[model samples]
Target chain A: TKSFTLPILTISEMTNSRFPIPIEQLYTAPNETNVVQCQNGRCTLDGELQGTTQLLSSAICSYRGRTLANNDSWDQNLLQLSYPNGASYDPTDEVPAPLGTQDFSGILYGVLTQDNVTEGTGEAKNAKGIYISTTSGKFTPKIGSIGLHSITGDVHHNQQSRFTPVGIAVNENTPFKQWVLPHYSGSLALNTNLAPAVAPTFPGEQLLFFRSRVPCVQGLHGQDAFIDCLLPQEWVNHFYQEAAPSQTDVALIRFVNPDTGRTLFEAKLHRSGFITVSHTGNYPLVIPPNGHFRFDSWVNQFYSLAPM
Target chain B: TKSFTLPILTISEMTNSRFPIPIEQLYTAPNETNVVQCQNGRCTLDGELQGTTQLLSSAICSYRGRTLANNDSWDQNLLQLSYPNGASYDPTDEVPAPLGTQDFSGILYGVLTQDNVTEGTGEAKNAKGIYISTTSGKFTPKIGSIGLHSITGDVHHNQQSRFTPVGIAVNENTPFKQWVLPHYSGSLALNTNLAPAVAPTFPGEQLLFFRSRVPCVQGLHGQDAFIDCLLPQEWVNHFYQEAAPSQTDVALIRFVNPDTGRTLFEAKLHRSGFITVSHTGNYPLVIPPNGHFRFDSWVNQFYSLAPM
Candidate 1:
């Protein structure tokens, strides 16, 4: 049986009013092939529009399986543009050419800073940037819905809008997202929470890349890597002190996209602590240089990525 | 918003000609208080019956969240009875009383052996027994559905039905499922594929309990332990020969419930691989004493529980 799919797009006006917006006016790539077209300021596609409104406080466009991929829209018109400063995106620009055949579902999100635009100004004029996130499964419509949420992190106020996205945060409960970079060969241990840690350091938004440390195994034959690291001494002590460990206090490790604060993959930290996603090729995960992958751990709440 | 919940019961006739059976006559407990009632072989519940039918075949009874608990039936009438040789099940009898209030959604399922019935013996018979599966969320009515699926395994023809449950398998994509047994405390590392194998051996269908070697960590706090055992010399060589040690060849460990052949928990294995689940009150996973808790590992598929 074919896998079920759900795709969603979320658009929110961070600042001033940009209502009564024309559907065609909203920025999307390869505009002609876009599936959900807007007419007279209204957006419609295959099914009933969810979270749709004439004025944009926040709007969401959702599509069922195949439908998202059907109209030749999703891949072509990946991003939704906004007035003034809203940024647009396409996966081809960020990811390597000949994208793996494995079906992918993720968010292409962008944010506009208020540096250039007035706080109350309605026009989309600021440092506008776009990002592309690829995950193992379909995207859930709601923010924080599930799979990989878009990359997130602070954008320096003075930074110029290169229109290129920065940082990524693997959302909670989702597997770590990885990519393959052509002509790239490197041997590096993925990050772990341990002294003498072994992880490659990349500058911000430089398109980071990861090759699996080893071959795939059953149950974890996904695009991500799972590393075993020693528990921080203090955390271990705290755990024993709080209460002897058992199933109730299962440990968890979260791989996050720095840009979005969403967890790409989170799983029990003990035996199967790290999480991964199913993928077709053996490519590694890559983050643009200048961006960093984040890890958080803890007994109850969250503890930041274990430092080297 | 509240979470979406779906509950399903899969029943297949062991022998022949019980296809037109009434939903009521299926032999669930607390018969009078049952929720979905059928008359004249017609099934009725809050929703239209999806697979209600007459003939020799398989059937499924599905219920929504509050509805399953609301009918005051699910827990009250969990077991399905059969003739000529069908065994019913009750967690109360097998599991410790004062069962934890934590809501559980799992299947009470069994299969017939060809010896007792036909090679394709449509009848449900043979060492009939009951098993309990506890999941973090409600069971999805169908596979590929959003929610997690429960564990299921095969039964050797010689296996006898003690009328008691055997093991628990943690299904794919779901959080680990755990149970609390009365008065139990032990510490031992579960097995991994590496040297100096560490795992407890249990008989065929006796209760199995697991305790971590050290206190459980917050991310993996559970009675089961996580050990970073080395890969078997040959397997390690084979992996290196195939692609070299990188993230791609990562190994995984799975904690399973024997009865269902379901993987209750699975994680990557590396330097120190494999993560177990978290439990409470120092109570380890208890499989009846006579039964055994099964574990398996391999490069691409199950390699059976590591021998001590």
Candidate 2:
């Protein structure tokens, strides 16, 4: 019930960390209410923590943030975040509003950039500054496992911390740790020539967010607009052989596993932007055994959703 | 390529057999050019013959139809058909013209009807007269696997024949056959609480189109607007623990395997209706072994796609 002056979070020692919500803001922004609303249940809420109870206390357990309206802390409603199609949380509005046709250009453009992105090539083709090909990069990634991977592109090098976690590359030279976005490799890039693309969990980490099954369609959580409402274009292409322009749109919807930045469903806009959760195709929406997991838009970014 | 008058096809023995191109039309229309241009390569070309060479002779020995243009008789360019979004082969035009936002209404509406369908009980929920619930029924079904399945709703009792094939039930009372639409049954219904929904191939039949992947997007072929450009909403819902409205659209894109007429994917409009193939989620688009496959919109009807 109290809105205290939150302590300022010190800047990250690592420079390569790329977060839609600056790491500091993740810390400084959390007052008494949304302090614990994050993946780790400590700092920022990763895509892996979208709707799970971990972000919410059973009864006033005093871990995550809660609003005056309800004790549900993970409810992006109070947090106020933005999404890929640019749908954001409007406190004055009813709930997470739907992005309309007018916003389609930007929404579709964002999709093409990632769709423009294939896999395992370090080269950036028409790629934006925000794009990263951890899959075919020159550097090696190392965590507590010490795989020795380095973040490229942005200077501060914040690829492996907070919301922007590190991942393992399926086709990397790093014998130990070839860090990459999972979608490009084993994530949403299911049943591909790339083969066996999978992202495993880590130490402080819990879920990979790959194959997540959050029921809320396009709700905001901090800086991420996680989407479990999707299927793989490749899977569909492979199924029907060739592809179906029959129900396609311009937007690209790629589902990534947040744990290792792997792609779960490399999807696109549901017809007419009716993107929702899929109950088919490997069932990317099938819930994990833990019965609790989260995946936000940041998950896409981890797998490579260009930021405007 | 000599165009022949070709023998005229007689009317169906059954009145219920509603062919997009009337069974009479399917046969009568098949002049020397498109003679073998159907599913059985006998009468009308079914959805299972889309890209597979089965519809074509190795070099053109003599079986399917071939335009003066190319030997690819399966090419719908020569065969002008309409789609859910009304995308048709302009003949004078290049290929399948992409449906625009203006066509969104029709495309989306058709989708909603199917989306409105939640399977079983022979009930039409906001459904068009065209929908079928082989999933639930009081009537018994019988194929040669004759469990005694009776065609319901649209009388003359033409549930299965040439273009409109029959199937077994995953949840039907009919023991032997329980003839039902595959999409409504075990077809695309993968990893579902409905559980283990699988559509097997028939005698002269093959490729249930439930997971078909013919890449000629939106092209007209007789009457069906067979769409493989999709994912499952339920699967996606089941995954993230909640649904992601992030990339959702208003259109419902359901993939129906033509073999047993089962649902491979129950999808929605791709964002801005940019529906295409998904290589994720069980990879509905994954090509079946035979390599030769086709799935027309008729496949949807076999399951349930409201015909306008």
Candidate 3:
């Protein structure tokens, strides 16, 4: 089997922390008998390689984000490791110490939870579906966003979208379901196409109706992660009104990193909707260390954009 | 392994067709080798019974919904056969003839797709998650619904929530992403508690959203079949909306026989929605021979129902 690379966190990496604690003294070293060959991020476990069938690309990561006691963060140095493709790790690799070393004494801090980072969001070039901090000091943090129309019909209404912080869920479903902020609306505009009974006599007097759920999951590319949101017909209809023959109304869906005002992805939306849209990245989207990622959806509408 | 009764479609059952056709003459009889010791909807498969552990209550069903020629519908008898918990069918058992036997011609049959029922929904007392047709001749077919409101304020406005049909996709991510229908709306409402902005102002204003993908394999009950739609928060939120303290708002989610206007199952929906709901019958739901199952959804608002 073709072995792949696995990220290993060393004691030196733990010492360089935004909130640092010398952790090597806290825990026992890994058992020596479990040692496996580790080189160039790949390792061979104690088993015979089973040919091509043995090489499956799966990414795994473990990291320490922010941990704390009494509001004082303990392990603030983002300690992250990753394994990509058909990679394995030597079990004998040493881990940082548990809590309560001489440098850190308040709370014991070996355990990790959702609040603490356990994996990266697969934004670095080394990991395919996971993100790990490397010697280059590069890692893309996870973020999410919700798109909405601004009221007041001013320049502020046409605001630039940004990366908003998000919550982490154990499974992919919870984040899409409970965590997504509701779509807040602005005033309704007059549309003569609506049925006479439902149309408003005056502008901005009545509300048109439609609803949708953009269920999504993390998908991968080469060595980066991106969000892949499903696009259903129901969602398209809400934003774009059907036009006459030989005419079209178009929209744009984007994934952005609000911190930098960068557009990670831009998917075109014709009158005919699609099944899915993803961030323009080399890797599929990854669940960040805290199991959360930032994303948003909005429509940049245009008339006469194309013909059906 | 303990054996269970297999629902067998006898010649007599085949003759009584809604769209009649003498199906038995088209094929040879089921081989005797396929026979297993069946008792009380349970059976022994080729081995001595160990105990409850040996007999997992799983429901398996094999049946034909429809066979036809030209536009003429043949064998519309709803030819359903079911196997309840602890049941097993001899692999050697013979199915009725393919199309184009001396008695039947034109269309070919005998191949089974997922469209052609291979398993039950899981609804026997033995199985925790399936439904099967039994003495009551009941099978709860699986169905889905999407709720929406009309913009008009008249008769067409006060519409009936009809059964909305849906399709299933294979990829886990695709189904969660693309298959969910959208809600269409055009007005904004003011909820001061939210960010200082107006939200959607439609009557069915709040779009409660959540998502869950119930990954499942066909399981069995004692010689019966049923559907065990995974109980996840995403599904619950779709069917029910929450309310204030002791006060409750009731919703009714049901699966009905569209042709007969008969309700197969009624899931009581309170503000506190249930995780999973199935038919109150011996069998889970069955896909009619035609493979067409119709359904719909609507709201029946109530008041002063009860105090918390």
Candidate 4:
């Protein structure tokens, strides 16, 4: 197996996950192994958790919106930050006391579970089928929403599309199983060309339905990690009329310092949903990250921009 | 990649599954692709599905109730039956096929979906995980047997588990859901050990309960090609009341010949619900060959034949 370059704690370079912030300044002792002291910006580490650092790439700091010197190697004077910003702290990078008398080799083992960090949602990637894929978000729902049925037509009349139960056991006999989410309204789209009830050649409704569910399935496995929640729902509220499509429907998010909760960049989503779901407009959610981020959705209206 | 000497359909030696029965007469032609059908039980080719029967030690087959004859450097033949009694199928001293010629080669791929031949249940020297520790019989239900629980239970006289309304949903947070197959009953085991009311472990009851509700959580891009069915309530009954502390409770079943509807093996399963849920004696079930052949169980209570 090819060996990994960074410690397991530094998985952010490949995927966005949250990890514990360390206070690097406190680990400066030569022989001490226990945590000495910790404050808002700095932390002292025992001799046991201390270790040297070697820069993997300079661009990592810049791409993550952090600043670093041009030097490629780290020996003694490396001042590692808790995060690129003011939030977390790394306790292992402190300068050690008189070195010759101390044995720093065993310090690495204690750091195993200490790296408590959760990477950003953007960094989620699955090699085999076991990983997650949905955009990571925090508290509020994202611009391209997934939960609830889109309300269409006269609100007083209460016209809404009844979401079919897309569950394994309930829908075991039906083909719509495995396409439901725990907190979202799951529905199928109608194929205009083949007439709504007829099975379309493209399996349009099935495809539309999966587009809304598959990512959510992946999201559970990804631990609901990073959500491209950069675009506030209010920003694209107008474009989400029960029927039509527009540009401000989707957005991308970033986690510059997942440890410190810092953001590096953001972008707009492009791809939309199945057009046949409604004679009206339907847009699929897209996240403009370095890699692929997919979604599944359904149209909310027969002729309007809202769900029905 | 090591090319297979046999057809994948014929040998079914994929990882996580039991071995496929050997074909009585088959040989690969010099043209390599031509299938040569041999008469009277003797044929030789490059490689067969189970590798070289030549690779098997005479002692191993004997232990499994078989006798082998070392015919020559190029070939080997099995002589007689071995297992204690009723369960042995003797092809007699049939000439063995070469290592990889049966189906998809010795390399593993799509072995479970091949449901053409009779698959044995007792532990085969090379059976897969799910098929390994299983048994064969009609799933019988008993009073007080546990079933998958639903949120709707009213604690009615031991909380009779419903046969519909499994807890899995379409979205993680969405409320629109459906009532699916038989409701899965929760036991002190599924709820306490596998799915604790507090901090849960990896592959915990919640995950397993959810995972087991559906097919294809892992393997072949989520395609389920093998037989997996709910456990009989009777098996659950035995587990709860009859099974000795030393032996785990298990379910047994077999696949019937599609055309004649005759079962290939008298005894099929030897499975346990070591980690999840299962029903006991009164397990209610609808049986049919080739559809579902799976059951739930727990492998608790270890002992040396001592009473509980």
Candidate 5:
């Protein structure tokens, strides 16, 4: 087998997701014994490259937004973001810390649940799919128009598309379902197309999803130590080295439901701040079906974004 | 650049989906000038292999259970299925036609769309996500228990997840959406986990989706000709060649909405049946999130599955 890159799935935790904890930076370190080589942003692990048989991508990014906590909740802040504005996106050129703003602008934050749920408790919490940050008024919605029409629609309508229900009894046919957020608190918006569930009933409307249970991992990219999110997909491990939470610190979100099972959220990260859904505008909270997932909340106790 | 496989996405057509049509067998013949080689299970076109980068899969399958039409409406049929039960799936060993029953069992058919919609003439119709077949009494639901608990709950609940809405005004903030099936007619259940849409308004309950319009193509597997479905996934075109449709004839479904748009249905085909949704059990109708999509009714007339 051709020796290639080793995939690391997550980053070490932080004191708080809201506060910047100096952890290993993205792709700067290698943490696996299976890893034999780390060079040029690729790792050779278990004799195969990270993207050899699987599909995954990442775009290096930087953030220079306001870092103030909101009154509505503690440990919450509005993170303004910017892109590298490269000819194509050169991970090598990615800024290690906040830099000058570029062509793109965004916010890296969490949902309203942080307001009610205790941070660092590691309990499932409610998160909004889309909204705007006012401190800079520079952040934009990933979907819909400038004013947050999509946010208003879902907020007023209360769709709860952002949050997923977890933990169904394995023994029970019709198991009682639980949620990270209340059923109605989830946000909804257009997103990339994904394969449908194998089985469904007529009038197939109930959305079915499972949050991942990715764990935090350590890594050394180059000479620098960068903490990143690791993903458990297809018998292989993946790292957040390439993903651009638009802002940086990648973490595996820990969430669970009533069904003896657990779930986690990790943004694959992307170069762009926004993406379009298949139909009318809708927002994707945890994962961006097309890579441009607008979330940058994870790692530490709670680097969660505060809702405007 | 080295020459590789030419990917053709679909099969020609049949007078009626309810019946079979003689088109091109999968990967047998080349339809595009970009195609140069069509040997083995792999195709080389546009200087690259089909699965070189994109993520797609197929499993050879056959049907031997039953092939009887249902009474729910006009032109409805139940196509019981079976797998070749190979140590590993072999595309060649895949019986050209139905062969002996082996290690697997399934149903290769369409949803309940043909029930109310006009059979042919190509019009969007309401389709059921999950249900069971009765004639010969062998077919099973793709999800829930062996019975139709998932279907009953979703049907009774009237959530409508299987269908997607289309045609949002490009200029308008919130465009009026249209759908192939009514909102209440859609069904929902567990399926594959995909990236979420980037933006969303909180309380995100509204499901946002877009329909695709795939066209039919022809191919020759060997000396014998067969019809198959084609997909428009990435820059490279994909055919239903490796797909099992489980039963036969693959065709690109032609569906459209008010917005200058269209959609189609084609199963990647599989070696098995039934997939689990995230929470309780749900079913995927048109596209299988995990490859074992319980769908086969395409090409020619509607080879739709019937409700028990």
Candidate 6:
């Protein structure tokens, strides 16, 4: 192939408006790649529960990024990611490496904050950041979605937009939303009697990167990771169709039950973190009957990266 | 409460021949109700993994040869179990039951099989049979410890005592008294590439049960029917322990993962499942600290009549 031009315009129209990819246009630092953590516990490259292990592993990983000596796109061999647990796995174990005891705090690594993302969640945050290609001047997600839903978390606000992605509420609603306000059927005092305790009150703020197979396990997509490896694009649509009814295309995901593979619910993704297809192309996006679909052009983003 | 007619014994010394729950005698059934068929996954309770919602939801479940009351279990009341799609959630949003979807098969009721069994390569065919009360007796196990090594496949010996436990294999090589084989080393024919794959695996066949926290929308032990609940003995240990190997003195109990809060590992009972308590006028049974302590008294097993 002649020097390849940017493929973004070609696949721009393929972006399904249904899925949301967290923050929209945040620029990836020169060394960053666009990545979306797993949502809806069932969605992941290594399949649902397996994603949890992968997420944790990638979070605390120290890697020497390099291309492979093989014909494969990237030199999987050249690039090496080491987990702190003294045990260095192939990283390429399962298609999407599932997190394991090695990736866990299991005494091997005495450091608690080795892979901390958010300050106090006490759980590893998936989708560290996007990876930037030095030679290609391209941006890819470090750990993005390989299946449908991206990142696991409760559906805080059903209609919350991308910029306002449903935020998960932490602690006793500390000082976030509904700060001591009384606006229920009549008057909402402390609302201490919110039935099922005080967890799922706010939206987006409480977003968790969960997988259905491994609840507490966070699924991390490697840099430049996308949803193409796990299943076809149609499968992503099956979930998106449900969100379409609520007029919310994208959704937040989480692994609520590792044993039962029960997916709690989806937080409405109203924001524009989705990859938008320009629609200028001749080929329209083809979604399968089973509901898998894909995104052609994505508006990628990244955040501040502090070196390990 | 008045004392029962039966006399209780305390910790005392005994020879290696000491037996647990004396084999010659029969004890009363600990629980009247048992999880006759705590069907799990699509395979165990439902019998098939690839069933439709209608087939699964309407699938009539039975226990102890009697049709279970739906009101108490899944049919009428909230489900102690369910599937992914709210295809199986409780009728009321007020409560959500567990959806047995992850791993494993159905759960048959039985009491604690045995404690202090040494690590071995041989088998005890009727190990579980020893715990059975009447044909109607059923029970659930929460805590257990895997012997250091186990053997895989048929033991070939017609004797019941020589049967093997289901797990990886250890070898009986000439170079050493006993060399550890893969988890399933016994099954391997000499000199095969697959031999290396059978290392001692964790969460081997022997499992112990302990109570899980009450159901909530969280991970692992979350939801009403996900895993086992703590036993009364556990509650006693929790309330009375100061901390240490002796923190909880109750025997026949296993500590679990702190993160999961479920007793999945560590078969720890107080002082080897015994405390030095002497009854009036009766000499106590002294158990040597180093020797394996055995149960020599009546056992009480509790069954869940209404897990929902």
Error of 2 at A178 (Å): 23
List ranges where model 5 is wrong by over 4 Å.
Answer: A1-169, A172-308, B1-26, B30-157, B160-308
Q: Once superposed on the true structure, which residue ranges of model 3 sit more than 4 Å away at CA?
A: A1-249, A256-266, A274-308, B1-249, B258-265, B275-308
TM-score of chain B of each: 0.19, 0.16, 0.18, 0.18, 0.19, 0.14
Candidate 2 on B39-85: residue-level lDDT in tens? Answer: 11111111111111111111111111111121222111111122211
Taking the tens digit of each residue's C-alpha lDDT, what string does model 1 give over A251-294? 33444545666655343332111122222233344323223223
User: Candidate 2 residues A17-79, lDDT tens each?
Assistant: 111111111100101121111111111111111111111110000110111121222111121
DockQ of 3: 0.01
Model 4 DockQ vs. reference: 0.01
Candidate number of the best TM-score:
3
Which scores better on TM-score, 3 or 6?
A: 3
- Candidate 5, residues B63-150: lDDT per residue as tens digits? 2122344443322344333221212222233221222111111111212211122223121112222222212122232211111111
User: What TM-score does candidate 5 get on C-alpha atoms?
Assistant: 0.19
Q: What is the TM-score of chain A in candidate 6?
A: 0.18
lDDT of 4 by residue, B5-117 (tens): 11111111111101111111111112123222211111111112121121111111111122233333211222122222224433222222111111111111110110111
Q: After best superposition, candidate 3 residue B208: deviation in angstroms?
A: 23
The DockQ assigned to candidate 6 is 0.01
Candidate 2 Cα errors over 4 Å, as ranges: A1-81, A88-122, A126-308, B1-230, B233-305
Candidate 5, chain B, TM-score (2 decimals) = 0.19
Error of 5 at A144 (Å): 50
Could you tell which candidate, 1 or 5, scores higher by TM-score?
A: 5
Q: List DockQ for all candidates.
A: 0.01, 0.01, 0.01, 0.01, 0.01, 0.01
| Cα RMSD for predicted model 1 | 28.2
Pick the lDDT winner.
Answer: 1
lDDT of each: 0.21, 0.18, 0.18, 0.17, 0.20, 0.18
Cα lDDT of model 5 by residue, A208-293, tens digit: 12122111011111112111222222112122222222233222223322244333322221111111111112222342122211
How large is the interface RMSD of candidate 1? 29.9
